């Protein structure tokens, strides 16, 4: 909601062994729920000793590879597993399947606090990076440096105090540091828009998302067409099955302080657009916003349109 003044680039985050299932109906790149949980986990450890805030994340995703294998006679995939230790009788344990992938990621944060005028912003950049290099980005660890120990420091720059001409040179200087990536935004208006193509059939909604991430072909009145983006099904929050429980009610909870619901996933849509296609970089940022009483929990990116 609150537009930040300065954006914080976390330039290279080579992370290993992230989760790659992310919902019961998708696989591949992890959910942006992991990224906004990561930035509020930065908020509870750094942002109070700097008296700043950090709300939104610019998910860029330079590289991607998944620990998958192509079997014989199939065009599908399976996942490469770990070998778990034995049971107490010496026999072998069962198999729970955890997909796994390596990533390389850039990040764009948003500051809102009095520490930006109480400090140099280099203090904010150094402290946020040196603490975030001891955390887990999606489900896996954040790696230290290598041959790539030259892009290690950050950058940070405001947008309100300054001229209004060479800020194009400034944000396209920023774009020189995230140039091979594909940003990930929320494009859920097209899920509305592809019901009118099915309005001749029914006003149903659950099979509309399963129409866009594939190759639909009819014959000549072969029918291939340019898909209008890199449009992919992402998960987009939780919807309540069960009423809110008082913090001593549910057996085997993580906490004895917070209240608990039983929820399940809701599915949206995204696109892997290059950052050139959007003018202002503050459009990309992902935010948590969810109303508590009726149980709809959701994350999206505002300011995209």
């Amino acid at each position: 909601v609150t537009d930040p003044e300065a954006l914080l680039l976390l330039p290279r985050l080579s992370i290993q062994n992230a989760n790659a299932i992310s919902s019961p109906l998708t696989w591949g790149f992890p959910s942006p729920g992991a990224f906004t949980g990561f930035v509020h986990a930065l908020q509870r450890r750094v942002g109070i000793s700097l008296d700043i805030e950090l709300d939104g994340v610019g998910i860029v995703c330079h590289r991607f590879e998944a620990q998958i294998s192509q079997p014989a006679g199939k065009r599908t995939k399976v996942f490469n597993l770990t070998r778990n230790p034995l049971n107490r009788d010496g026999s072998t344990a069962a198999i729970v399947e955890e997909g796994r992938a390596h990533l390389e990621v850039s990040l764009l944060l948003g500051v809102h606090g009095d520490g930006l005028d109480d400090h140099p912003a280099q203090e904010i950049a150094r402290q946020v990076q040196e603490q975030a290099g001891a955390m887990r980005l999606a489900g896996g660890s954040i790696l230290p440096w290598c041959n790539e120990r030259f892009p290690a420091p950050n950058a940070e720059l405001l947008m309100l105090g300054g001229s209004d001409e060479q800020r194009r040179k400034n944000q396209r200087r920023l774009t020189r540091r995230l140039l091979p990536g594909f940003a990930l935004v929320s494009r859920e208006a097209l899920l509305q828009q592809h019901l009118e193509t099915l309005r001749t059939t029914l006003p149903e909604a659950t099979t509309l998302d399963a129409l866009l991430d594939l190759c639909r072909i009819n014959f000549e009145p072969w029918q291939v067409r340019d898909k209008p983006g890199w449009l992919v099904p992402i998960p987009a929050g939780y919807n309540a099955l069960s009423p809110l429980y008082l913090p001593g009610e549910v057996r085997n909870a993580r906490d004895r302080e917070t209240p608990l619901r039983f929820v399940e996933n809701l599915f949206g849509l995204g696109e892997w657009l290059s950052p050139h296609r959007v003018a202002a970089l503050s459009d990309l940022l992902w935010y948590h916003h969810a109303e508590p009483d009726k149980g709809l929990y959701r994350w999206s990116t505002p300011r995209f349109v």
Binding site: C61, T76, G99, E188, F219, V263, L269
Partner: protein
Amino acid sequence: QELRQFIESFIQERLQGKLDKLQPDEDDKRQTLLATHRREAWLADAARRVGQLQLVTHTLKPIHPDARGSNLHSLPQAPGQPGLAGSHELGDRLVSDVVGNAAALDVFKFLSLQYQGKNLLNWLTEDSAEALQALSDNAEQAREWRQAFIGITTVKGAPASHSLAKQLYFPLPGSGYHLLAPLFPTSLVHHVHALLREARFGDAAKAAREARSRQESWPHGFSEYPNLAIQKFGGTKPQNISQLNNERRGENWLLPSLPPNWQRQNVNAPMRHSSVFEHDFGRTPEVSRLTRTLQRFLAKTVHNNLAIRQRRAQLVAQICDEALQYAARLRELEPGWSATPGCQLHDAEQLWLDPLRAQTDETFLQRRLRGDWPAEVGNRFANWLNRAVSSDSQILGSPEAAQWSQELSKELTMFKEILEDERD
């Protein structure tokens, strides 16, 4: 009351199915007890083993091996925003899986065969007039069946969770946190799994593929799902999980959601006699679809022109950013860019998409591209991209030549200003 033969085929069918279980050493009580209690005590076994299970729509057995907890049983509500729908706005053709005791899910088939043939699946618990005439039991037996058959759809145990569950935190707008414990949508994954098994294979989705194979097809829609992934639940035995067997077999099919740029090639722009000068176009493997789209979307007229006039406005950026990504993932992304072999022609590509100076950096290395006008790659780019936006005598003489060359001019205008600030 001609609906007791289902009870006959449930009792005597299983009793005759135990004909391969022949042990001539110690069956002298097992065979007699099986013949006796397989019929009469089968109602007792289906009463005592009718209370180990429950109906579900939020199972947790499919998220951990032995996570003994409480499974949900009600559908989620409607999401109040526009543009995102899931396991609550699904249709009224839902199917509740039956999680419970793995060695007790055989009486569930005899209890749920009443939704096959007749319409008396809702006659066993309530409306036992469809369970008095062909049941052939007394008041104690009819009451015991109507009591034991209510423990499926109702609650089985206490509402709880487990240590192997997820239970995420969510920040509230101006408050603390709620714990969100997500569940596995067994009903939704059954619906999408049956939906995709008729879309990847089946009658029409494969007969249209043979119609393509006979090269004579009229328009009819088939579907193709490339690069999925498979996940197994349970393992060698998936019947310990809820049903997962009717046509699931522990194989929920996962749709791909990958990033675009995670399967790249290698950057080889060396000092070659054509790998320096002939590499002024950006010959990549992912531009064939864009060239084919710009070709095959140029023949339609403006008789349906309320949608096709909003795609070439983004294609200039969608082809210029490809050259930007190539020149910034090959030159700077590669660790080297040497002098061109046959430098009288292989030097302009080393000027435009080239890295910084190196160990062969003499005096005149940071004094040519640091002061030379970096605006010569505009006309060559317009000639290259204007070869895929080809001119025609029926295109230049028509009113589409200016309306398709203005886009190439507006694309070539800004790329020189973008790439004229790296050195100069």
